[PDB]
Design a protein around this ligand. Structure first.
Ligand SMILES: Cc1c(-c2nc3nccc(-c4ccc5c(c4)CCC[C@@H]5NC(=O)c4nc(C(C)(C)C)no4)c3[nH]2)cnn1C(C)C
Length: 266
């Protein structure tokens, strides 16, 4: 059920390179758009991923990038997913030509929140939620990508909290201090993602290094209100950054708050 025949794939364009190597755009059976991760040797705990891929196949939500299957008979292995024509959210936000309205920005937040509420309902952590790990389709809908895959990364620079590739700027204090991941670390990251959306893809804490950011958030420093964010929107993102993890909202509560603000500010 999980296996796709790689001979059914036609490779058309290169999309980029990430933690696991190259990702390509292609067609499945000459017809249907797909994205294809080509997993570089040494980059992934492959047997563990393949077992988990069976669980991931059952995760299905309109705002989650759909896993179609895997190709595991020969190396490199492929991961075949839904193709998102308008690319990575972070780049999309940074293209000033879009001149987003604040209603569109809130809708992007809601798209992600719906995906995350679904994952939370399945007790499934994303673990690296950020604009760089969201994608945009040809209709401008944002979807969440590569949920859970952090577990299978073999690179210590990514995994270690002091590693060069670790997502310090998306991490709550208890992750920076104790590497304590939970639903509530996804909540913190979601707040930073809201901030990224309303900041049109600026780097969080853009004037600090990772090391300085870690020290500052331990001391209680927070991101502050993006120019395009209303007070009501800012209240929602800020609620994600409570020092105490148990005082942070759930994704269901965030979704309810986002919907209320949409109704109030339209
Ligand atoms: C880029 C683009 C698209 C585009 N559509 C797409 N549809 C589906 C998937 C991708 C896709 C997803 C992810 C990645 C890329 C592409 C390329 C960069 C690396 C990135 N990340 C990982 O591969 C990766 N990261 C991880 C972590 C565990 C570290 C989170 N696991 O895998 C799509 N890209 C379309 N246009 N463009 C631009 C105008 C060229």
């Amino acid at each position: 059920s999980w296996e796709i025949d790689p001979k059914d794939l036609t490779f058309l364009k290169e999309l980029g390179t990430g933690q696991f190597g190259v990702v390509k755009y292609g067609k499945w059976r000459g017809q249907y758009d797909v994205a294809i991760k080509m997993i570089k040797e040494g980059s992934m705990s492959e047997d563990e991923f393949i077992e988990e891929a069976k669980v991931m196949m059952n995760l299905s939500h309109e705002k989650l990038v759909q896993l179609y299957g895997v190709c595991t008979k020969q190396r490199p292995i492929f991961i075949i997913t839904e193709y998102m024509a308008n690319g990575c959210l972070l780049n999309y936000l940074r293209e000033m030509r879009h001149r987003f309205q604040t209603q569109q920005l809130l809708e992007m937040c809601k798209d992600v929140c719906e995906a995350m509420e679904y994952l939370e309902s399945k007790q499934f952590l994303h673990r690296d939620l950020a604009a760089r790990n969201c994608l945009v389709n040809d209709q401008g809908v944002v979807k969440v990508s590569d949920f859970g895959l952090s577990r299978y990364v073999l690179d210590d620079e990514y995994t270690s909290s002091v590693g060069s590739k670790f997502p310090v700027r998306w991490s709550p204090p208890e992750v920076l201090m104790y590497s304590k991941f939970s639903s509530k670390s996804d909540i913190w990251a979601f707040g930073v993602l809201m901030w990224e959306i309303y900041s049109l893809g600026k780097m969080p804490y853009e004037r600090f290094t990772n090391s300085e950011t870690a020290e500052h958030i331990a001391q209680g420093l927070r991101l502050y209100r993006p120019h395009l964010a209303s007070e009501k929107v800012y209240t929602i993102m800020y609620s994600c950054w409570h020092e105490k993890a148990d005082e942070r909202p759930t994704f269901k509560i965030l979704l309810s708050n986002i919907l209320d603000v949409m109704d109030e500010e339209s």
